[PDB]
Design a protein around this ligand. Structure first.
Ligand SMILES: CCCCCCCCCCCCCCCCCC(=O)OC[C@H](COP(=O)([O-])OCC(O)COP(=O)([O-])OC[C@@H](COC(=O)CCCCCCCCCCCCCCCCC)OC(=O)CCCCCCCCCCCCCCCCC)OC(=O)CCCCCCCCCCCCCCCCC
Ligand SMILES: CCCCCCCCCCCCCCCCCC(=O)OC[C@H](COP(=O)([O-])OCC(O)COP(=O)([O-])OC[C@@H](COC(=O)CCCCCCCCCCCCCCCCC)OC(=O)CCCCCCCCCCCCCCCCC)OC(=O)CCCCCCCCCCCCCCCCC
Ligand SMILES: CCCCCCCCCCCCCCCCCC(=O)OC[C@H](COP(=O)(O)OCCN)OC(=O)CCCCCCCCCCCCCCCCC
Ligand SMILES: CCCCCCCCCCCCCCCCCC(=O)OC[C@H](COP(=O)(O)OCCN)OC(=O)CCCCCCCCCCCCCCCCC
Ligand code: HEC
Ligand code: HEM
Ligand code: HEM
Ligand code: HEM
Ligand code: HEM
Ligand SMILES: COc1c(O)c(C)c(C/C=C(\C)CC/C=C(\C)CC/C=C(/C)CC/C=C(\C)CC/C=C(\C)CCC=C(C)C)c(O)c1OC
Ligand SMILES: COc1c(O)c(C)c(C/C=C(\C)CC/C=C(\C)CC/C=C(/C)CC/C=C(\C)CC/C=C(\C)CCC=C(C)C)c(O)c1OC
Lengths: 55, 373, 48, 54, 240, 49, 76, 373, 76, 54
């Protein structure tokens, strides 16, 4: 029994490892793409705003 | 053909109760509305573009340059409104006549209700107006309430830091794909019901009086379809903007926020509840429970009579429940200021107390009056 | 031998699942590590 | 997540027309149902005329 | 049609489990920047992509801040220009297709972003074309703005030899022979047309390994559950 | 529930308890692994990284 | 399906052909009385919740207005 | 349980023949491929834009900026190729083993085949490359062949004078919506098969030897799924473009026609036939018949034995049919010039004569050899 | 469903438990002979059509080339 | 670029090439698209009349 089931248990981990990987990339696809992620360093001119104002 | 058997088994030789009123039409209307939505949605999909630069332009191109494209677009919008009208009356029929004792049918129903609400929300986001963008941010933000994984989930759905093209395109895909899942769930809904047959307004065993469906409840469904089409076309051809918001006819400005943010009217009852609870999380949960309380409904039936035809105290409590559901629909519309808030808080307290507490106690009292308890 | 294993972690289905899940949790570490060694070495001098 | 409207409200800072959250000039939530103060991005004051906000 | 069919070259990115040489991609990007960018465009490639391929973040920015880009509308509404950003794409060598057509004697230098993928046997073709400007034979005559490149369809490419030995100097110092330059730019264009070439091949190795484990096993489980029947020994014992 | 407040009912559960815990354990391990939860995985020496 | 639905006994059931009977026998003759009969058995259970919804709605509106109306005493 | 009953009768205990070979795996593979396509298609739909200015840009954005977006796109393309491989082997199994005597199952099958071909055609139009645009114009032009209403129909589909944005957007809508109709038609397919049960390679009544499906043909389907996934991932991760057209990586230039225009590998057999017939209309018709001849197949069975396991002459004719199907696939690729044309003309004549004439005559001869006729 | 599929009589059927029997009994021992046995019963029906497909394919290619090749005598 | 007389297929001409020019020319205010103004303004037809006459 332990020989036959160990094969079932072995296979499972393997499938389990692939299944998490497949599902992981998919899940990851909906995450932010490279284009958006690459957003930073907005430049702001202090002179633009005077006291009592928001921009 | 073997299929003809299935064709007959569910629509021709199906034994139906002879005394079911016009309310039993409504579910069939929902199915028709689903098809109508799908058909109109398909004819919106041949010209709509899910790009934030071109979504509003594509919608205006549909309304102005496609032959009868305004007709199909406003049929789609007012058919979503008609879908929610028929859905609310279907759920009210199920609550009033004790049809929730068909527990599997009821649970597949509340799953269908959740799917339809998600589909309508993403569809309202789809035209990319001012109101759609601020509405999306708002409800997507609702998710952030989650205690630990909230932020991630929100960002996932948005597909970025804030709703932007990333969202619009995936919302187009999801809004396209969910009504077919709704159709499959409706097939499961019909199956879980034929195993038990429909209920009657008296709530009694109608096995002694059943009639065919082809000549008796088919022409009745055809007449109900004709009346629903009359109301839908007088909503489309005469008052095409009485249910929508004017601010959705402006383009989506992330810099400009509207002075008052609403979802469309059928989300209002929920909106009220959310606003009522002070805690953000509390609101989200209560909101969910608002819909989920229904699923919980078959475990709260403590009466020996299935329907409310012979139960006057629970009839009074039911109409008070419909009354403060209308009150919560009104409050959602009202802005945040006295005394709209207090009503909202009470109305939510009264809603949950009538569904959770008052109806089983009233059913116990009604059983005591008939010398049954 | 496997017998000891079987009677301990492979005979009770609950334990069967436990051994599977735990093994899988570590397998990824090992597989990724081993696999990377293979790939990187094949292309050593070309990466980065 | 709405936009607070600057130069409006009962705390001379901000007001969010969505549910009535009033933020002070510091952007701290003072009245209403907003849970936490507005966030301050990690900017950079390179000059009294140049500020690199994140 | 009748066209010379470029031969197979022993590249390195061909190996089933072999990744692109990244020094060659860096050299080919230098070749594109100094030679090919005057006429060809790279609309779907932006500096950020390079990061993690042959350049670091800071270096990439260096590259980015070494070019000028328009920057939408000014507050005044007047379009202005800015130092290139890691988010900026590669600059257009011609604002509009017409400009390119005009400058390049009617020829539209095709965007070299997916050229290798868009040209049958691209990597080879590219190398061949860039290294195939041989003299037109007797009997064929080409008009101005045309060149007899056996590989090019019609053997009359508007582009002139774009690579003269020592056309540009490789920063790495590797001798800039015409070929060394054509091979580098073919590797780079290849990379351009498939920035994921390396990442994919890794998965490939991994997939094979997994199948090489799961496939054999799934077979043992199937042969367990099918042995029962495969050992069934029927027998008919009529009453007789 | 009246029927579930029972002596054998209790015995059954007690006998069932260990198995139940095992299942939760599998799921917990599963969730940690599937989500690549690093807060938890950071504890494991080899799994780290 | 039909035939195995239920067991009844000695319940005779007479009926007429559609074309043999008037389509709308005494439709408004008894329809009105019946509709009215119906409304008087259900109006006391149905109507007073919606009546107090109307009162609460009006009240809210007016109260809100008064709330908005400037406090004369204030600012003076 | 009325939802689980279906599975028990259909997937867990269905009495299946014990001796069906690996070819009977293929249909289940097709179902898996359908889901795979749908899943990958959904994850292409969250970033694809059906605008002619932005379609190629959105596809490149999927391949370059979305995390593992190249993986999902090339899985979708090579899964369409794997779908057609499994479809051709499924149809070949049905032709070889006499499974077309299940006539309703066969007709629902050929309807599914038409729907899958239309879905793949519009999907290949969707990335808006050079090859997609010229390919679309070509087949849309095919319709113009219609004797009287052809021009109108073509213009209708195009939605304008020539394929342009109008087409792309409606092709996106139709390519989105048809795989769900394919799933419903597959439910009807398996349904009409449940009423009959599967066939076996000997072609005999297998009622004496049937086994369950859960432990015997489930692990077999799992192994076939694993092998098909191995071939799909070695097609995606190692030779991704081997099954594509390099000219599809150029943007669509209405001005120029890629010289080597050719339909994908699976449409070639048809392409050859179309090119073979001199008359345009003739080509279109023959093309259609090419697929339809199959539907016609259950009325051409003149043998007293269902399968070809014990029929060697019809086995030889079947392998000659597979041979000139491969020949027609090759010819389609070859350009228009001697002698590719003649082969095409013969190969088409031999294809129609083997299916229409030679196999029933051979079955009559085989019945005469066994002293049956 | 099972139980009503067919009527057989006096057909005894023996079997063994999966774990009690070797997983791959004589797998390559007889597998090879059998696979070879199989190939020789089907090769004459299967292979010669694909052989003449290969000949026609090559022929077409060559013939096409010759067709394309230039005849020097043509120009004179 | 080049300018040509409008065609029946031409849309109505822009007053400004971009909204920031509208901000610069209208003292920081952005005059909105009047295509759907009536539909976008609550009680638009009335509002419009009222505003223009108010
Ligand atoms: C009141 C004045 C008339 C009167 O007294 O007549 C007696 C009559 C009542 O007679 P009764 O003996 O008490 O009951 C038997 C019914 O008459 C038997 O007929 P019924 O009224 O039960 O008919 C079935 C019902 C079935 O109704 C439906 O199908 C409803 C379908 C769902 C609602 C509509 C869809 C849209 C919903 C949007 C919310 O159809 C109707 O409700 C009336 C349809 C009229 C069509 C236009 C005729 C001109 O009054 C009516 O029939 C009222 C309805 C017609 C007016
Ligand atoms: C040759 C040297 C080895 C040898 O003699 O093997 C004997 C053995 C045959 O032994 P036998 O006792 O005469 O036949 C009983 C079978 O073993 C009983 O097993 P079976 O062949 O019925 O197994 C079911 C079938 C299931 O096959 C499928 O499900 C195939 C699904 C269709 C193909 C994939 C779809 C895409 C196609 C694109 C074209 O699997 C196979 O045909 C072989 C699976 C191999 C898995 C990987 C092993 C490493 O040969 C094979 O099994 C051939 C394949 C392995 C070599
Ligand atoms: C609206 C009023 C409709 C009406 O006519 O009310 C009286 C009617 C009486 O019904 P009954 O006492 O069963 O007798 C009928 C046969 N003689 O009572 C009924 O018609 C009962 C109708 C049941 C369904 C009512 C649904 C109303 C809308 C509910 C929306 C909200 C539902 C919950 C949402 C969460
Ligand atoms: C390829 C060769 C496959 C092969 O092995 O051919 C011989 C095989 C013998 O099968 P049989 O005589 O029934 O015996 C099987 C049990 N010993 O015969 C078979 O394998 C029959 C296989 C039937 C399906 C073959 C499909 C081949 C591809 C057909 C594509 C076109 C289908 C029609 C399209 C219209
Ligand atoms: C850097 C060494 C390169 C490389 C690798 C290529 N070019 Fe150019 N190119 C130019 C023009 C005007 C054309 C179009 C000419 C025509 O169509 O007649 C091209 C074309 C190409 C191609 C496409 C070939 C095809 O079959 O379509 C390729 C692969 C190519 N080039 C490679 C102009 C120029 C330049 C301005 C003088 C220079 C510099 C380059 N090209 C440089 C390169
Ligand atoms: C599979 C079938 C469907 C398709 C293909 C589809 C497609 C579309 C498309 C393309 C749009 C954008 C065009 C527009 O702005 O109106 C849209 C909008 C919308 N859809 Fe659907 N739809 C489908 C089914 C449904 C269903 C069942 C509902 C109801 C739950 C629904 C609710 C909406 C709503 C509310 C909008 C927004 C309408 C507006 O702009 O005001 N759709 N749909
Ligand atoms: C997607 C929209 C829906 C469709 C298309 C639909 C369809 C149907 C149909 C055709 C019927 C049978 C005819 C009838 O009795 O009216 C029915 C009955 C029923 N539905 Fe739905 N339904 C939908 C939503 C719901 C929801 C949301 C619920 C749960 C609240 C629900 C619960 C029920 C119940 C309990 C019945 C039994 C009626 C009775 O015997 O009293 N349905 N539905
Ligand atoms: C409802 C599910 C599906 C959706 C949402 C979907 C969506 C898409 C989208 C957005 C594309 C364009 C992206 C790309 O270029 O690859 C596409 C391409 C394609 N789809 Fe689908 N698809 C679905 C199902 C299918 C199915 C079932 C087939 C097979 C018949 C199929 C065959 C194709 C093909 C051949 C392409 C072209 C791939 C290429 O660019 O080479 N799709 N699909
Ligand atoms: C859309 C793609 C298709 C799917 C998903 C599909 C699905 C299936 C499934 C699950 C089976 C049962 C398992 C099996 O015997 O392989 C089956 C059997 C069958 N299918 Fe299909 N099928 C498809 C296409 C077709 C086509 C195009 C035809 C017609 C040529 C067809 C005709 C049959 C027949 C005759 C059987 C019975 C097999 C036998 O008993 O010998 N199928 N199909
Ligand atoms: C007699 O009992 C039945 C009954 O047998 C059936 C089948 C239906 C179903 C009727 C409909 C026409 C509703 C359609 C339901 C769907 C499955 C919606 C799915 C929509 C599609 C896109 C198809 C009933 O409504 C009903 O009670 C009145
Ligand atoms: C024993 O007889 C059967 C059988 O009972 C069943 C249900 C199937 C169906 C098996 C599958 C898993 C195929 C899936 C079929 C579909 C309905 C495709 C629809 C796809 C979806 C998106 C869902 C068989 O293939 C089969 O013969 C082997």
């Amino acid at each position: 029994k332990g020989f036959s089931y160990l094969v079932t248990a072995t296979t499972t981990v393997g499938v389990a490892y692939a299944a998490k990987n497949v599902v992981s990339q998919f899940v990851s696809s909906m995450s932010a793409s490279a284009d958006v992620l690459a957003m930073s360093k907005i430049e702001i001119k202090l002179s633009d705003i005077p006291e009592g104002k928001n921009m | 053909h073997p299929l003809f058997k299935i064709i007959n088994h569910s629509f021709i030789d199906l034994p139906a109760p002879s005394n079911i009123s016009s309310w039993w039409n409504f579910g069939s209307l929902l199915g028709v509305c689903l098809m109508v939505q799908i058909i109109t949605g398909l004819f919106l999909a041949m010209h709509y573009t899910s790009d934030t630069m071109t979504a509003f332009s594509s919608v205006t191109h549909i309304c102005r340059d496609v032959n009868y494209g305004w007709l199909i677009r406003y049929m789609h919008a007012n058919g979503a409104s008609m879908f929610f009208i028929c859905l609310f009356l279907h759920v009210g029929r199920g609550l009033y006549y004790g049809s929730y004792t068909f527990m599997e049918t009821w649970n597949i129903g509340v799953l269908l209700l959740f799917a339809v609400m998600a589909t309508a929300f993403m569809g309202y986001v789809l035209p990319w107006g001012q109101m759609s963008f601020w509405g999306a941010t708002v409800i997507t933000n609702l998710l952030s309430a989650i205690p630990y994984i909230g932020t991630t989930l929100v960002e996932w759905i948005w597909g970025g830091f804030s709703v932007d093209k990333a969202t619009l395109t995936r919302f187009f895909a999801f809004h396209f794909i969910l009504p077919f899942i709704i159709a499959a769930l409706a097939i499961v809904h019909l199956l879980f019901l034929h195993e038990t047959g429909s209920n009657n307004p008296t709530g009694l065993n109608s096995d002694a009086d059943k009639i065919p469906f082809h000549p008796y409840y088919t022409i009745k469904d055809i007449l109900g379809i004709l009346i629903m089409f009359l109301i839908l076309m007088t909503l489309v051809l005469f008052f095409p903007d009485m249910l929508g918001d004017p601010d959705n006819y402006m383009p989506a400005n992330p810099l400009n926020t509207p002075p008052h943010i609403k979802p469309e009217w059928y989300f209002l009852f929920a909106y009220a509840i959310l606003r009522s609870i002070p805690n953000k999380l509390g609101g989200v949960l209560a909101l969910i429970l608002s819909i989920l309380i229904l699923a919980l409904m078959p475990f709260l039936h403590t009466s020996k009579q299935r329907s409310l035809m012979f139960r006057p105290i629970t009839q009074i409590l039911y109409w008070i429940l419909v009354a403060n559901l209308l009150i919560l629909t009104w409050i959602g519309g009202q802005p945040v200021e006295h005394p709209f808030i207090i009503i909202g808080q009470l109305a939510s307290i009264s809603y949950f107390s009538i569904i959770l507490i008052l109806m089983p106690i009233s059913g116990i009292i009604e059983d005591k009056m008939l010398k049954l308890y | 031998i496997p017998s000891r294993l079987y009677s301990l972690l492979f005979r009770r289905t609950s334990t069967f699942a436990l051994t599977i899940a735990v093994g899988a949790l570590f397998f990824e570490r090992a597989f990724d590590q081993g696999a990377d060694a293979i790939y990187e070495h094949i292309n050593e001098g070309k990466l980065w | 997540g709405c936009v607070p409207i600057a130069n409006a409200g009962d705390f001379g800072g901000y007001y969010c027309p969505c549910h009535g959250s009033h933020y002070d000039a510091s952007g701290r939530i003072r009245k209403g149902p907003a849970p936490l103060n507005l966030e301050v991005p990690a900017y950079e004051f390179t000059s009294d005329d140049v500020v690199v906000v994140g | 049609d009748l066209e010379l069919h470029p031969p197979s070259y022993p590249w390195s990115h061909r190996g089933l489990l072999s990744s692109l040489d990244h020094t060659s991609i860096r050299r080919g990007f230098q070749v594109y920047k100094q030679v090919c960018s005057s006429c060809h465009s790279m609309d779907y490639v932006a500096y950020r992509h390079l990061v993690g391929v042959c350049y670091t973040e800071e270096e990439a920015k260096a590259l980015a801040e070494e070019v000028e880009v328009q920057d939408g509308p000014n507050d005044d509404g007047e379009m202005f220009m800015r130092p290139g950003k890691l988010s900026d794409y590669f600059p257009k060598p011609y604002p509009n297709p017409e400009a390119a057509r005009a400058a390049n004697n009617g020829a539209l230098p095709p965007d070299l972003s997916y050229i290798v993928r868009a040209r049958h046997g691209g990597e080879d073709y590219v190398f061949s074309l860039l290294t195939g400007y041989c003299e037109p034979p007797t009997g064929v005559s080409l008009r101005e703005g045309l060149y007899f490149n056996p590989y090019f369809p019609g053997q009359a490419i508007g582009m002139a030899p774009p690579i003269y030995t020592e056309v540009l100097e490789y920063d790495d110092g590797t001798p800039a022979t015409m070929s060394q330059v054509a091979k580098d730019v073919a590797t780079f264009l290849r990379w351009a047309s498939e920035p994921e070439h390396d990442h994919r091949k890794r998965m490939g190795l991994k997939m094979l390994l997994m199948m090489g484990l799961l496939l054999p096993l799934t077979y043992a489980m199937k042969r367990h559950k099918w042995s029962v029947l495969k050992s069934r020994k029927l027998a008919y014992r009529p009453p007789k | 529930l009246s029927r579930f407040l029972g002596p054998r009912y209790r015995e059954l559960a007690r006998n069932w308890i260990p198995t139940a815990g095992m299942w939760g354990t599998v799921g917990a391990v599963g969730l940690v692994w599937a989500t690549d939860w690093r807060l938890i995985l950071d504890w494991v020496p080899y799994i780290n990284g | 399906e039909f035939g195995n639905l239920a067991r009844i006994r000695h319940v005779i059931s007479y009926s007429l052909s559609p074309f043999e009977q008037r389509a709308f026998p005494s439709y408004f003759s008894k329809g009105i009385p019946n509709v009215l009969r119906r409304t008087r058995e259900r109006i006391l259970r149905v109507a007073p919740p919606f009546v107090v919804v109307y009162l609460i709605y009006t009240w809210g509106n007016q109260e809100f207005e008064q709330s908005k109306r400037k406090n004369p005493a204030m600012y003076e």
